[PDB]
């Protein structure tokens, strides 16, 4: 009942299932000598560590949260240092979301992971700037969660890989994400493939007022590799 | 054998063996830290591994720490437990401590955790001409931060407690027996010559 991955280990979970997004794992670049032919360094022992983020607060009037996954780890730790002085990467992720409330709370979350989530501004003709997208570690907040901030409805948002956190039954979710991009290797400082988003469908309630019910998100790059920084001559 | 986690001043009695974690405690606040020093005054002075290894001079081996949570059955929450190698210094914030060797332990699933300490060493180093003492450098730290808040129902009390244990492993070695200063030299014995008369 623990996830010992490298240096750190998130211990003592509830029973959980590795629901692979779609049907695949990271795979480590099977054969491309036609592109960027300086063999990828492929670091493996010094990146896989479950970078746990800040705990967020779930109150009655809360409305949703979103993180951009290559963006949330650009300034954190050993993966954050390899984003500078490298310009190509290739990695898949693993996400473990776990809230904790007693047996007197009630509610439901939708933990969904959205590939290529192009956002949209409400009621204007101007595209979103650089600062409304690259928020960072803190993430963001849905302004209009019913339309997922781009017009496509939430009722059909179960077509993506998703799990439910229903506080009557469970309090944990786990999604494994493969490399979802058209190009074989991508640029980390300006493109964001996945977009982890959690949305409370049924809001919480109790007899007293505004119980926090804090949530924890933990992200770990699975099978990462970068360009080569060391060459013979 | 349990250690004295509550290393603050004015903790008199058997209140040194526990730390309270109240409901009104803000996130990322450090609870304790253990300097891994046997010979020095701290949480590991008066234990079972720190009294046998006073009689000997050189020690080197691996240890094994165990914590235990003594709250009610309903209460939940998370902690985080770091280990600092002997080079670097003690971390002060939670974010600068997560990049070390940590585990993220909660309360609802398990009520006990196990944390292997890899290697320690020590000596006494009387190296000069006169009677001087050269303290060994501080090897290691084990510190603990509050990840999320404590969540109790309306019926349980809002205060919980932790208890820490310690035990050496099966490669802990000792050498060069000396005499321990633990009691004190000599004091008044009430009938100090029962035998003579």
């Amino acid at each position: 009942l623990q996830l010992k991955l490298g240096n750190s280990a998130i211990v003592t979970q509830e029973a959980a299932n590795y629901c692979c997004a779609y049907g695949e794992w990271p795979n480590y670049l099977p054969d491309h000598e036609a592109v960027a032919i300086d063999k990828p360094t492929q670091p493996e022992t010094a990146t896989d560590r479950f970078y746990t983020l800040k705990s967020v607060k779930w109150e009655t009037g809360s409305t949703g949260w979103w993180w951009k996954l290559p963006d949330a780890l650009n300034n954190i730790g050993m993966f954050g240092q390899n984003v500078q002085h490298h310009y190509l990467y290739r990695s898949g992720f693993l996400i473990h979301v776990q809230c904790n409330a007693t047996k007197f709370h009630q509610g439901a979350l939708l933990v969904v992971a959205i590939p290529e989530h192009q956002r949209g501004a409400h009621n204007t003709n101007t595209s979103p700037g650089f600062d409304d997208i690259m928020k960072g570690e803190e993430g963001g907040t849905f302004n209009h969660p019913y339309v997922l901030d781009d017009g496509t409805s939430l009722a059909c948002a179960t077509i993506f890989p998703h799990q439910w956190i229903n506080l009557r039954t469970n309090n944990s979710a786990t999604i494994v994400l493969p490399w979802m991009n058209a190009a074989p290797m991508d640029f980390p400082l300006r493109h964001n493939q996945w977009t982890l988003a959690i949305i409370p469908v049924v809001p919480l309630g109790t007899r007293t007022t505004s119980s926090m019910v804090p949530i924890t998100v933990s992200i770990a790059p699975m099978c990462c590799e970068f360009n080569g920084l060391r060459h013979a001559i | 054998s349990m250690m004295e986690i509550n290393n603050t001043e004015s903790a008199v009695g058997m209140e040194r063996l526990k730390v309270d974690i109240s409901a009104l405690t803000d996130v990322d606040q450090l609870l304790f830290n253990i300097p891994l020093d046997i010979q020095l005054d701290g949480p590991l002075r008066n234990t079972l591994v720190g009294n046998i290894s006073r009689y000997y001079t050189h020690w080197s081996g691996s240890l094994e720490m165990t914590f235990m949570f003594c709250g009610s059955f309903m209460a939940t929450g998370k902690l985080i437990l770091c280990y600092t190698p002997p080079g670097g210094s003690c971390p002060t914030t939670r974010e600068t401590a997560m990049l070390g060797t940590h585990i993220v332990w909660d309360f609802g699933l398990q009520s006990s955790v196990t944390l292997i300490i890899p290697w320690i060493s020590g000596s006494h180093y009387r190296m000069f001409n006169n009677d001087a003492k050269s303290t060994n450098a501080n090897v290691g730290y084990v510190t603990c931060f509050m990840q999320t808040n404590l969540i109790v129902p309306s019926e349980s009390s809002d205060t919980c407690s932790l208890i820490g244990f310690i035990a050496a492993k099966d490669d802990f070695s000792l050498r060069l027996m000396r005499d321990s200063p633990d009691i004190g030299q000599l004091d008044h014995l009430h009938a100090a010559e029962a035998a003579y008369q």
Partner: antibody
Amino acid sequence: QVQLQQSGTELAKPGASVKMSCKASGYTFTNYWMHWFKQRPGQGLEWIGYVNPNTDYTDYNHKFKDKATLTADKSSSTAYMQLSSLTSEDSAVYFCARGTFGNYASFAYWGQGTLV
Amino acid sequence: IQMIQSPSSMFVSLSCRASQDIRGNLDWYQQKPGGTIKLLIYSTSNLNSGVPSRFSGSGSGSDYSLTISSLESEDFADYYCLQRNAYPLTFGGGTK
């Protein structure tokens, strides 16, 4: 380090309104409630209300329902409070405190005060 | 709900009643004459991190009190109370 820096003092003729600010720095602003207090000079204090900057829900004391309004800004990290229809008895010092992560009312960090 | 504090001035057990029961849920504050406020006791018996350990609080259903062993020069400050049980939350009168 948690700091609650309020504005300097100001005064106004009766029949007007006034707005103050309690700028906070050193923590994540959208997690804690921002309570506001009132102390007449020489007497005890009194709770006015709070603002929840994660949701912008406010809850007022019943005496101060029509006097004060409470807003909160996320970008500038600053909580405001605007009075209305000032009289002679509004001359007091006004405080600002911080709640807890779990929504409890025990105040460990405070402002310096602002006379009216 | 109204809370009254029985001594009006002090020249060292400062008690305060309550209109109802409050089930713990009481804090003790202090105000320096410069204008700084920090709390001393939270949840009617515990001590804040960074206080001299001579302060202590009693506990009951409705009648709570503070106990100071020894006095000091800058110990001289007006002391307030607070119930956080039900909104609207009310202070007390204060001493000294």
